[PDB]
Design a protein around this nucleic acid. Sequence first.
RNA 1: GGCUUUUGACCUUUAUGA
RNA 2: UCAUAAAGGUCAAAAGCC
Length: 346
Amino acid sequence: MELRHTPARDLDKFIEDHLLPNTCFRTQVKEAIDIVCRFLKERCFQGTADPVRVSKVVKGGSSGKGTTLRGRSDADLVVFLTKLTSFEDQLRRRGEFIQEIRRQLEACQREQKFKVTFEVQSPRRENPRALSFVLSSPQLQQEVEFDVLPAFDALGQWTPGYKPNPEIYVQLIKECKSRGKEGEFSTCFTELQRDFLRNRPTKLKSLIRLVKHWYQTCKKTHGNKLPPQYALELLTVYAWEQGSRKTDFSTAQGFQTVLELVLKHQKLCIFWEAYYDFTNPVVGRCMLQQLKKPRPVILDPADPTGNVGGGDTHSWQRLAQEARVWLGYPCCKNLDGSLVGAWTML
RNA sequence: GGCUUUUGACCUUUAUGA
RNA sequence: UCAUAAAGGUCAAAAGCC
């Protein structure tokens, strides 16, 4: 029943029975999300003496991408505030707004609205990106974990399917590389990150789910010294774009392709021009600098300052060693014993 | 041939915030 | 119009099952 004992033919069956989200489970999470969202915009930042307001609460993480694994009762919310004027503004006052959110959550708890339990000092205080807590509500039938991140609304009103004005990227690059905070404000472009995955073929998302499951399995051996999970998601998308491009493909072949790409990480230089490009001199120069870095280079399609590769070859070494082992498992093999084969790249 | 689910798309509408 | 949840209808993709 485990993935490592599942034959290649049966990968889609494994995904269906173990990875695809459940209806009743998902409805609980969505209601929990609405409860927190309404708390933020109706209670937390709504006082008449309070100038700060919520322009939008954006659902990030896997829930925004539609790549959620079954049994995952959690949500990552980015709350964009009208007060922040810049990225540096966010970097300084984020600890302040997190304190306020926590104080209002305590107030609602005092008023017996719901029950919240905060994560105790897993990160050290200063500088935190998120407020972490578990929500318990009488309306809900299960508990839901939350990560809430206050952010400067860099995109403003952005419509999916369109390129942001590059001037926001110029602003980002200037502020980032002035204080060495490359990739620090990728959360501001959460909407771009989920948009990059939203319209992908259904089976590609299922493959992402499978890759994520494999990743988290390895994560129980190595812990947090692996590359970011987001890097594996981008790598999976890259594999499909270069080697398949079809709604219908072999799940096993896609899986082996990603594993082999992990092995060949020393030659990975991956980027997109989905939301930015070389047309703007400053932006294009930033892109070029990134492509000249030690491999693997996997540039965030939403943030030109972010190399998801991590700049840690040790993490990729540990993942490559898992990749080589898993290539000998039944999940990459036909019943006769031979490998299903990887996609032919370009 | 049929059903269901998951993930998206489109046309309206409701609530809340901007 | 954007964000979060929901209502009605239609469409698509993939998967599972009969």
